[PDB]
Amino acid sequence: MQILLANPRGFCAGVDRAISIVENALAIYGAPIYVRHEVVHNRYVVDSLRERGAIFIEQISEVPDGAILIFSAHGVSQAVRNEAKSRDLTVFDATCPLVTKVHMEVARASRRGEESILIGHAGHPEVEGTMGQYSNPEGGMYLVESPDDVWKLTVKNEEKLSFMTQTTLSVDDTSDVIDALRKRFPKIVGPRKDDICYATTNRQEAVRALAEQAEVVLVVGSKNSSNSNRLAELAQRMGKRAFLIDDAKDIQEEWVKEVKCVGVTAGASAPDILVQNVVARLQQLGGGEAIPLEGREENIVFEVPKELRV
Amino acid sequence: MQILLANPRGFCAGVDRAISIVENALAIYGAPIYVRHEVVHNRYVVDSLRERGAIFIEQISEVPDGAILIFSAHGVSQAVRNEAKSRDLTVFDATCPLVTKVHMEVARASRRGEESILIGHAGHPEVEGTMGQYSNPEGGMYLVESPDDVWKLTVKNEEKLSFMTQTTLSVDDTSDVIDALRKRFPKIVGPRKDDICYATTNRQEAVRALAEQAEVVLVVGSKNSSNSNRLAELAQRMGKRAFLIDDAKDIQEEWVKEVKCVGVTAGASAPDILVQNVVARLQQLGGGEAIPLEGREENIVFEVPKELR
Ligand SMILES: CC(CO)CCOP(=O)(O)OP(=O)(O)O
Ligand SMILES: CC(CO)CCOP(=O)(O)OP(=O)(O)O
Ligand code: SF4
Ligand code: SF4
């Protein structure tokens, strides 16, 4: 059985930074270090940080005065940020810069009292945070998840409209939504394409090339990871059997029995060691040496704040 | 005399990457290493690289077959790139990712035969490289440097128009140009704001804060550095005397005599050691300890290609 590895895969610049922010805070200040919501959506990472003293909380009110608090890479609303600022706490913002970029545009629109439309999935922490950057009653902030949502959306002044997007969406599906938005609101303004980050675009591109060769595609990632789910869905929609797994232990013999070519990739929040273990498991299941596919080279890095340098 | 230092200042992610690309290529393949155009617009850096064996040229003709060629951080046209590929040359691209981003948009408009307008300064290498990404005769690629240029521009089809900008422009001036573009061509499409990079925006914001405190501003940067010139220009427009200098030796006493507050900053292509030397000179001229102003923390880094690490 041939094992192919998607490229790129795994850790993105934002996730590497966020994890290091927590690890260094713990290394420099010791336990406990409080973190608002999972720093990244990966159970292995979250379990590891908890084992080292990190305490994940739901609300800032749970954090004691004088403590160190970290905001997750997905971002937080202005209400959350301001609350933490008024508190006697040392705060480190692990929000990815690529998410912060979208936040600033939303705050700008709210400032001008002009309505904005966010393309994203309700309930996701990044959506909560981005929608949370808008607070002008005279304007408006709306969420759409599909063309159907656009088709039924009502706006106060479509003459002054702008749109933004979640950073981990399906490139193809988002294209459909944008097309619907421009047909419905011809004067709507936005970025050249969307706010889907380089990492999401690249990983979906890479899994597309992977799915063309592999019969089965394994995507290392947690159930609550948006970008990881998109990787698995893309493969499935291409007609291949795809599985979203947290680690090698989740692999069932039945999945790869008689399979001649199995592909493996990982969401932006999944550590490379998980992939290494998956490869090891597949090999004892008949797989050979893992073959990395040729892929677009990524060179972006986001440094942790100077204070947390180690 | 009080010495203030702007923040951020100096090296950006693209410049640091580009210089490392040349340094690494010299260590790996040895001299000589050909580089198309000054890797970054800084005399000190360029002079030093010549030392280690780097040879800077403007045309691919100047480069012998079998040689290693590196494109500068400013970028190159498709014509140059293809001319280099048609030759038996080993190529490494030090173009900054933020410049490449603009290139890709121009190529897209070219492939669709749809016109594009670039806001920038004629003759600059980045402008030549970006304009050089357009090759479809059906459409068009036009350069505008001011609102007046916009007022006199006519296109084939303004219903399918888009714009891009140089990465090192004056934030304020570019705003004026875009306002003109939108009034002239109401259906024009572009980014949310412009293509001016984070480094340029941050250094201009920082020099603005520096100038509101300093009577005189010294900008460390070479004459041909676009972004560096914009820093001195900004301070000057604020009514302060500002000088663009390559090093401490260029400082003329009269500039800071009896001056109570002098500010120092550096363009994106100027090494920190130059700033340290400038501060040292100001101190022997009566200045005290250099005080860093509070500023936007930058955290972006661009890695060199694995092939050169
Ligand atoms: C922090 C982000 C959002 O940009 C992505 C990184 O991966 P996850 O940690 O799994 O987050 P998401 O579920 O939003 O893809
Ligand atoms: C490579 C660029 C253009 O993005 C900027 C870095 O600074 P310089 O090397 O001085 O180049 P420029 O004159 O274009 O500002
Ligand atoms: S997936 Fe994209 S936006 Fe989200 S942390 Fe990673 S790099 Fe940043
Ligand atoms: S000034 Fe901006 S675009 Fe030019 S090299 Fe630096 S970071 Fe890149």
Curated annotation (Swiss-Prot), chain B:
Dimethylallyl diphosphate binds at H41, H74, H124, S225, S226, N227, S269. It catalyses: isopentenyl diphosphate + 2 oxidized [2Fe-2S]-[ferredoxin] + H2O = (2E)-4-hydroxy-3-methylbut-2-enyl diphosphate + 2 reduced [2Fe-2S]-[ferredoxin] + 2 H(+); dimethylallyl diphosphate + 2 oxidized [2Fe-2S]-[ferredoxin] + H2O = (2E)-4-hydroxy-3-methylbut-2-enyl diphosphate + 2 reduced [2Fe-2S]-[ferredoxin] + 2 H(+). The keyword Iron-sulfur applies. Its cofactor is [4Fe-4S] cluster. This is 4-hydroxy-3-methylbut-2-enyl diphosphate reductase. InterPro entries: LytB/IspH (IPR003451). The gene is ispH. HAMAP family: IspH. GO terms for biological process: dimethylallyl diphosphate biosynthetic process; isopentenyl diphosphate biosynthetic process, methylerythritol 4-phosphate pathway; terpenoid biosynthetic process. Changing H41N: No effect on catalytic activity. One of its GO terms (molecular function) is 3 iron, 4 sulfur cluster binding. It is an enzyme of class 1 (oxidoreductase). [4Fe-4S] cluster binds at C12, C96, C197. Addition of Ca(2+), Mg(2+), Mn(2+), Ni(2+), Co(2+) or Fe(2+) decreases the catalytic activity. Addition of Zn(2+) results in complete loss of activity. Is potently inhibited by substrate analogs in which the hydroxy group in HMBPP is replaced by an amino or thiol group.
